[PDB]
Design a protein around this nucleic acid. Structure first.
Lengths: 468, 95, 96, 82, 106, 95, 79, 105, 91
DNA sequence: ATGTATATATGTGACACGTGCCTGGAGACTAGGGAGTAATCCCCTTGGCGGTTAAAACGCGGGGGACAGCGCGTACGTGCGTTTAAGCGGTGCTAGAGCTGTCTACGACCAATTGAGCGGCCTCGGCACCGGGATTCTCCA
DNA sequence: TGGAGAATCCCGGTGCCGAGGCCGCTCAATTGGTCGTAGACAGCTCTAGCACCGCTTAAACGCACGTACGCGCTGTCCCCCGCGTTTTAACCGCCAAGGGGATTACTCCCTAGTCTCCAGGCACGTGTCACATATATACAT
């Protein structure tokens, strides 16, 4: 068949876990490999003669993808998608569920927004045998408590599929385990026993010989969590360069001019009297990050109708922007294709203005447009005669999973606090089928605020050895 | 379809029996923050303060509109003019 | 473990007078606040008027006649004449 | 990349406020006077509110300050605690 | 055993808390013997009249619970309370229904 | 002899610059005694009390007449009607 | 009658002080009624103040305090 | 000995403001410089009012202040007009004002 | 005996204008005005002290009372003169 | 053109100096207790994203108030002659407003109990929707 | 009067959550003594409103008269109202971390008393002035 040996092993593991009657959490890395294995597992649990209904809960962007999968696997297997506008919702509430007992029951695919708004209806009239999730990243901060209401009725079996459960935040295993196995509640209420001095260390390799109880706690930490979590590797390229830039004297003058925050008296004479000031800065870290990235972002104090300084001198304010320009003019001789990843759209506007002056045409996903994305990709991009060379993306937004991956070089302008966002940013950056080397670059500044953020983010990422 | 003058009376009869909020909350708390920005810098606001301010503003505006309506009815008219509002504020001593 | 600072309110007394007046009528939680605010406003007006009247006439004591005249001043119309009659009846029973 | 904050009081809201007060027909030149009067009233209340907040060596405005500021102008408001 | 100062007077409001509030506000140097009794009697009478009006207004509209709408209806339909509470606005109260005779169609 | 409208303006210009008493004192202190007779029996009045009452009454009447004049000018007229006084008292909240 | 003592030329002079050009012949009754109501409302508080202090004569301070209660402060006489 | 008003440079007395504050029992305790502040505020207000009244009386070619000049000084200022809107002065009069409609043409 | 501010008002008038007299009818008005301002300021300060659960009247309470009662530019000009007097009294 | 409102000469009841006495503001010792200081903890804040559903904007026809000009009638401003009561001076008279002097009784202050009022949990009936189903309300005819 | 499409409460079920009712403390409410100063009552003195009469002289009243403004009418124009499409923002969730007021503990110095005392605030007598009566020019019919 289509599936390989490893998929069969995953199926057998699911059957063996159902043989013990335990609800399941699965953390396979390959996104497409989970859904076909789950569909085959349900088909094995459907053809045996069981009459239980099934609920699938996935994000809205992939529901029709599920409609492809049941189309691709077996045409005799049908399903319903309970996603519609309000007028037809009451039309489809009873369309395929005439009675609690019958020969045929449909398998229902819902969304997060359906299970959170007007979700009382589902419990009131009918029980469900299997409940399955498809993301597993929305149950950490214990904000969605309707799962308790779903728990009040007897849900026999729950399966939770997660991409990566390790964000290295406190009590993620607490929160996830209490949705799947709430039986042990008091055991986790104190985290000191699992916690060790090895977690809090300043070494680059994070291994200390002088500390005690590290090996026993690590061994028990993978040992108890090993039956609950299955993680499968495909086997049984990538080059990231982080380049730092030197700080110019003018931006440094702004830096030690706003440490003591004396900006109001200095620019009060320059500004017109009677206009006033927009407001004293509130938080330190976010404003420091804006200042480190570019001082022009801070120009909300002044008023102009898209009035920005000349492009010739805009280079002088930052060393990061100058280094990016040097890297880009070095990369035009390589005759390759670049992506620019950023976090704030105002920076994605300053950059857009800069390349609207440079004369190259760009393609951008900001999130202001709805359903124009596909048209943006098809037109002036992903074409042999497409003359666009610069593609602007926000890490928090959503781009299409393009197999072609015409863009081989990725540039991160600013870093993220959680490395998993960078992981999915690399996942979109390079995909299967291209042998092209992927020289990922990062623009950073030395001896600054973001160096602490980068160090804390890499220390956050470095806990992937302790879980399996 | 309908003759003009029926929907206005239906709206009058419907809006005078309901206890709700007619002005949206979010643009009002931004108008309140932008008005308070002029006097003191970096102020904070509880929700009950802006709700009370909204209630007071709606009560004041409904009273002013009732006085303006009485002033307009006094001059044998049906429409409302700014001069009626100016006269009502001059008589009430607000100006 | 103290939840919050204790608050002095006339909820139970207002409920008792309501049950005395109407036998089968309840009250929502939003009207009790209004009633408490009304009672406290009347109390503050009466106390302020009595204090100012005591200050004006160069007298160091608050007596029943000062609050009598305060009720005659603050309460308008027929309410003033009907509040004096009930209040005087209570003072007579207290002394004798 | 911005809208004015006084334009946030739109025309249907003013029309609904006029219909609550019992108005049949409305001209097209009374929205500016209404916005100006609302602005002046809010300024006059917020001045006393900020004065009360600044007296007590605080930086957050509570409901009691607004209630006392409304009480100073003679408009007593019930329901919120004063 | 001991008896309270409100049980002997026949009142329903407390008497030692009115004394406590009067003493805590330093309105004068000395107080009197029957002034808190008089104040409690006046407050109890006013509360009784207001609750009578509100209960009648709520019972008229075929309801068994008092909401601020009924309070506003009871206040605004009386001359004495309308004079007493002319400048007071009640939260979630509304507006008394009134339509001028000129606006009525003919 | 004179055209109508000149003596009225001359009286307006003459009466607005003089500080005197326009109402006679003796009929006013009899109206004051006969009004006070209804409430308490055998009262006595100092002269300063009735003079202050006269001053307050004249100030109130001049303010009311100015408001009534403004209300009458609002309706494109020159004469004064009782309905203008009623409107001014209704707007001012005296009624 | 004591309310007829407020004659027509006095009302005309009071109107001319306020800046009125023409005067109709039906506003004297409303003026007398409003003056009567105002005097009643002041004299009620004045007599209450006089009766509080166990006196039988009305002084100027009682009138000043009664006017102060209604919000119309009067200067010159001592308060 | 020296007075508490000579050292502060004021013209109003300071021990009588203390005597009036103590005789009115506004609170339990007083402060050190509160009567000085109150006397300064009162002196400033009196100085401004007397400046306005003296200017108004000197404008009309007179050498003595009467209540007419006081009313003219109060009613011709926005700040004092807002401060003393509801106050009527005995033997004051009325501010001269004639509407434009009544004027002959 | 009656306590009046006649001599102090006369002294401030002679300080302001060297050759202007005052009639006996304006002194009563001035005294009434001073006493009214005094009573408003004292009442506002007492009520503000009562609201904030504080048993003492300090210079900041009367500062805020002046900021509340006096409107417009008069409030800003009265604070500057009053603060200058308090500084000279302490030092 | 012809008859009325604003500028200059000579005579008079309240103000700016002077004496006098008399309770209070200011200088000085001594208590005391309220205005100044560091540890927990739970709601705002700043720049983003995704997704839904009522609400606001624009346009277009149309009918019904706003407004200006016109004519008529009839109440109000102006002037002259006839009563009339207010303002004034002077007199007689007695209730009552302050103002001391002396007794006694009811509030302030402090120890010492002790049972109502303010937090927390059980347990449900009036109030909020769905869904027909009569019942009228305005717009042609 | 008579149809006709369209709002609008009335009568049913169907749940379901804030109101009404149980505990467990705990802290001010209420008794008993003891002290002390303010209110009540009694006289006593001077003064200032309440009648009351004659003079007289500005002002209110009454009545013609004649004209200007208020009110009703007609014609025209233009400007809000109502209804239908079409975008768009409020509302609701969710990161990711910090930070800042809401609350709780401990010391010192500014304000309250008592005790004296003497130049500065209120009562009684003098020189010296800003409005009353008579002569001269600029505007409305």
């Amino acid at each position: 068949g289509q599936l390989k040996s490893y998929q069969l092993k995953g199926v057998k593991w699911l059957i063996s876990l159902w043989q013990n009657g335990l609800n399941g959490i699965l953390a396979d890395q390959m996104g497409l490999g989970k859904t076909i294995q789950t569909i085959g597992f349900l088909s094995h649990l459907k053809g045996n003669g069981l009459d239980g209904p099934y609920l699938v809960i996935a994000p809205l962007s992939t529901l029709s993808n599920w409609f492809n999968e049941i189309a691709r696997f077996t045409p005799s297997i049908n399903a319903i998608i309970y996603h519609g506008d309000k007028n037809q919702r009451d039309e489809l509430r009873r369309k395929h569920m005439p009675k609690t007992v019958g020969p045929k029951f449909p398998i229902v695919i819902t969304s997060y927004e359906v299970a959170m708004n007007d979700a009382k209806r589902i419990l009131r009239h009918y029980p469900w045998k299997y409940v399955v999730i498809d993301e597993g990243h929305r149950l950490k901060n214990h904000k969605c408590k309707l799962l308790r209401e779903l728990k009040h009725l007897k849900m026999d079996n729950k399966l939770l599929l997660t991409g990566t459960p390790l964000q290295n935040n406190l009590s993620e295993l607490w929160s996830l385990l209490n949705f799947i196995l709430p039986d042990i509640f008091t055991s986790h209420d104190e985290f000191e026993s699992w916690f060790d001095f090895s977690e809090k260390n300043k070494n680059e390799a994070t291994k200390e010989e002088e500390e005690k109880r590290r090996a026993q706690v690590v061994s028990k930490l993978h040992g108890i969590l090993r039956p609950f979590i299955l993680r499968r590797m495909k086997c049984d390229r990538k080059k990231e360069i982080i380049m730092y830039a030197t700080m110019t004297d003018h931006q440094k003058k702004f830096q030690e001019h706003l440490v003591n925050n004396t900006l109001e008296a200095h620019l009060g004479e320059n500004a017109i009297r009677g206009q006033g000031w927009k407001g004293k800065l509130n938080n330190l870290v976010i404003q420091l990050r804006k200042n480190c990235n570019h001082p022009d972002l801070l120009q909300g104090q002044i008023d102009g109708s898209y009035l920005y300084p000349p492009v010739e001198e805009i280079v002088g304010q930052c060393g990061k922007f100058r280094l990016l320009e040097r890297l880009l003019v070095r990369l035009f001789a390589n005759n390759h294709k670049v992506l620019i990843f950023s976090q704030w759209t105002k920076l994605l506007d300053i950059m857009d203005y800069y390349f609207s002056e440079k004369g190259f045409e760009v393609c951008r996903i900001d999130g202001s447009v709805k359903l124009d994305e596909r048209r943006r990709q098809i037109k002036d991009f992903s074409d042999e005669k497409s003359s666009c060379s610069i593609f602007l993306l926000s890490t928090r937004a959503g781009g299409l999973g393009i197999n072609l991956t015409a863009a081989d070089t990725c540039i991160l302008y600013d870093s993220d606090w959680n490395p998993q966002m960078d992981l999915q940013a690399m996942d979109r950056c390079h995909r299967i089928g291209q042998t092209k080397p992927v020289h990922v670059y990062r623009l950073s500044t030395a001896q600054s605020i973001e160096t602490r953020v980068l160090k804390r983010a890499y220390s956050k990422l470095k806990l992937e050895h302790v879980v399996i | 379809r309908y003759r003009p003058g029926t929907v206005a009376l239906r709206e009058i009869r419907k809006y005078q029996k309901s206890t709700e909020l007619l002005i949206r909350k979010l643009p009002f708390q931004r108008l309140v923050r932008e008005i308070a920005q002029d006097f003191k810098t970096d102020l904070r606001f509880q929700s009950h303060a802006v709700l009370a301010l909204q209630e007071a503003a709606e009560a004041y505006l409904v009273g002013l509109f009732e006085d303006t309506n009485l002033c307009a009815i006094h001059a044998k008219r049906v429409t409302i003019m700014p001069k009626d509002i100016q006269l009502a504020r001059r008589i009430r001593g607000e100006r | 473990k103290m939840k919050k600072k204790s608050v002095e309110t006339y909820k139970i007394y207002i409920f008792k007078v309501l049950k005395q007046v109407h036998p089968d009528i309840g009250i929502s939680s939003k009207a009790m606040g209004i009633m408490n605010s009304f009672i406290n406003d009347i109390f503050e007006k009466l106390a302020s008027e009595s204090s100012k009247l005591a200050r004006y006439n160069k007298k160091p004591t608050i007596t029943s006649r000062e609050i009598q005249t305060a009720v005659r001043l603050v309460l308008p119309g027929e309410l003033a004449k009907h509040a004096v009659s009930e209040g005087t009846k209570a003072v007579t029973k207290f002394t004798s | 990349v911005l809208r004015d904050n006084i334009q946030g009081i739109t025309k249907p809201a003013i029309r609904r406020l006029a219909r609550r007060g019992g108005v049949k027909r409305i001209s097209g030149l009374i929205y500016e006077e209404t916005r100006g009067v609302l602005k002046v009233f809010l300024e006059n209340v917020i001045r006393d509110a900020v004065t009360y907040t600044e007296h007590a060596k605080r930086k957050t405005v509570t409901a009691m300050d607004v209630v006392y500021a409304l009480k100073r102008q003679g408009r007593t408001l019930y329901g919120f605690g004063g | 055993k001991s008896v309270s100062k409100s049980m002997k007077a026949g009142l329903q409001f407390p008497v030692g808390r009115i004394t406590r509030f009067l003493k805590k506000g330093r309105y004068a140097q000395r107080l009197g013997g029957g002034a808190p009794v008089y104040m409690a009697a006046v407050l109890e009478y006013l509360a009784a009249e207001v609750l009578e009006l509100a209960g009648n207004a709520a019972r008229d509209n075929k309801k068994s619970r008092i909401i601020p709408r009924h309070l506003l209806l009871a206040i605004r339909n009386d001359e004495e309370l309308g004079k007493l509470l002319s400048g007071v606005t009640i939260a979630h109260g509304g507006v008394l229904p009134n339509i001028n005779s000129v606006l009525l169609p003919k």
